[PDB]
Amino acid sequence: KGLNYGSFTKEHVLLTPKGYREWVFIGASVTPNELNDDKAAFPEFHNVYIDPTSWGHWKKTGEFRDGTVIVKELAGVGSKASPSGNGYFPGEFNGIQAMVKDSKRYPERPGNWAFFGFESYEAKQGIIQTDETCAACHKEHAAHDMVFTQFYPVLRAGKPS
Amino acid sequence: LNYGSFTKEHVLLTPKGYREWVFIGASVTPNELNDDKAAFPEFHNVYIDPTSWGHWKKTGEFRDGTVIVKELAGVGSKASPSGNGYFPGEFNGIQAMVKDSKRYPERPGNWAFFGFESYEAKQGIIQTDETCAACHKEHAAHDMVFTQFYPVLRAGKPS
Ligand code: HEC
Numbered sequence: 322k323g324l325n326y327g328s329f330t331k332e333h334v335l336l337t338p339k340g341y342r343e344w345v346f347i348g349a350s351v352t353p354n355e356l357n358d359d360k361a362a363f364p365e366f367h368n369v370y371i372d373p374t375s376w377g378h379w380k381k382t383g384e385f386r387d388g389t390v391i392v393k394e395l396a397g398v399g400s401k402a403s404p405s406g407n408g409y410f411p412g413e414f415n416g417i418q419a420m421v422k423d424s425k426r427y428p429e430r431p432g433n434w435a436f437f438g439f440e441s442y443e444a445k446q447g448i449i450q451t452d453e454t455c456a457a458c459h460k461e462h463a464a465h466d467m468v469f470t471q472f473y474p475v476l477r478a479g480k481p482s
Numbered sequence: 483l484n485y486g487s488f489t490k491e492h493v494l495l496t497p498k499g500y501r502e503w504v505f506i507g508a509s510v511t512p513n514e515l516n517d518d519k520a521a522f523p524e525f526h527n528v529y530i531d532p533t534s535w536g537h538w539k540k541t542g543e544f545r546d547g548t549v550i551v552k553e554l555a556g557v558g559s560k561a562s563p564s565g566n567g568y569f570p571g572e573f574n575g576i577q578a579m580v581k582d583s584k585r586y587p588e589r590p591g592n593w594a595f596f597g598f599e600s601y602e603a604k605q606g607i608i609q610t611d612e613t614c615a616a617c618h619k620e621h622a623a624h625d626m627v628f629t630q631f632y633p634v635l636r637a638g639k640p641s
């Protein structure tokens with residue numbers, strides 16, 4: 322069996338994940354401010370991680386086990402040009418978002434996903450989000466099980482046939 | 483333990499499982515911002531082997547036997563529910579660099595660079611210094627690696 326990644330409070334709120342940068346990377350996207358009227362909803366680079374246990378489970382099944390934790394880490398754009406050419410390059414770390422799939426802890430959320438915001442990296446836990454703030458966009462547009470796997474080529478290529 | 487596999491000529495065998503290594507940052511040079519032909523199209527996802535990553539959290543240096551994999555991927559779309567920008571598509575190929583003072587003692591920084599003809603290739607191709615190391619030497623922030631673009635490495639090192 323596999324470890325339980327993610328620690329929770331007695332009210333089932335995920336404590337601020339540490340060590341996620343050593344989980345399994347599944348994809349990176351970028352919404353720069355300048356392309357979104359100098360205020361993107363989520364600045365700017367986004368680096369996404371799934372915990373190792375649920376990555377083993379995904380390789381075997383193409384499905385997110387209960388106990389999946391997915392962390393989106395946000396970063397500024399640092400430059401627009403490099404010796405490799407024109408585009409977008411990351412600067413400093415900005416913040417994180419996370420989501421947890423758990424039928425037991427979250428029996429009445431869409432998909433059993435609890436979406437967590439964090440007010441800082443120094444914060445002890447996150448704040449669980451209403452269905453209008455987070456999960457509604459994810460159920461409408463995400464390709465599989467409310468996860469935007471159409472932007473996670475590690476996922477698509479890592480599921481079996 | 484070491485994470486490369488080699489032939490007798492110190493040629494690196496096409497790495498398997500590098501997506502299970504430690505991701506250290508991502509950038510994007512789209513073709514539309516580069517005269518419809520980027521040098522390295524388009525998204526770049528960079529990884530360092532876990533053993534070298536452990537030594538980096540200790541020393542902030544690249545130990546001998548360090549392997550870094552840059553995986554390339556197309557721009558799949560330029561808009562999504564999160565807004566305008568660039569979003570990944572399909573996997574294009576890989577590049578790799580390897581640090582070894584004893585096997586590459588004449589390469590700049592003991593770093594051999596490897597190109598790969600496709601995902602199905604068995605071994606890379608090792609590159610002359612002008613093809614790759616020339617530009618890494620001139621411009622990379624640390625020991626030929628563009629750590630100005632790897633915040634996981636910068637946040638990770640012991641300052
Ligand atoms: C990425 C995200 C992730 C990573 C996992 C995933 O399924 O992609 C998490 C844990 C998370 N968000 Fe998010 N979200 C949206 C899109 C399009 C992407 C991937 C593309 C990209 O990287 O830009 C996401 C969409 C939306 C959205 C539509 C406007 C809203 C309102 C939200 N998301 C809201 C939230 C959260 C509330 C603050 C929250 C904690 C999220 N998402 C977590």
Ligand code: HEC
Pocket residue numbers: 403404405406509510511526528550551552577578579595596597609613614615617618622626627628629631
């Ligand atoms: C990224 C790269 C990496 C990842 C580690 C790093 O040092 O960033 C590898 C293993 C690799 N490339 Fe190089 N490359 C260049 C730049 C600016 C970056 C980081 C930011 C980004 O993703 O865009 C790189 C630049 C250049 C360059 C300047 C004109 C040249 C000539 C090369 N790269 C050449 C090569 C290779 C020759 C075939 C090769 C195997 C590389 N790079 C590998």
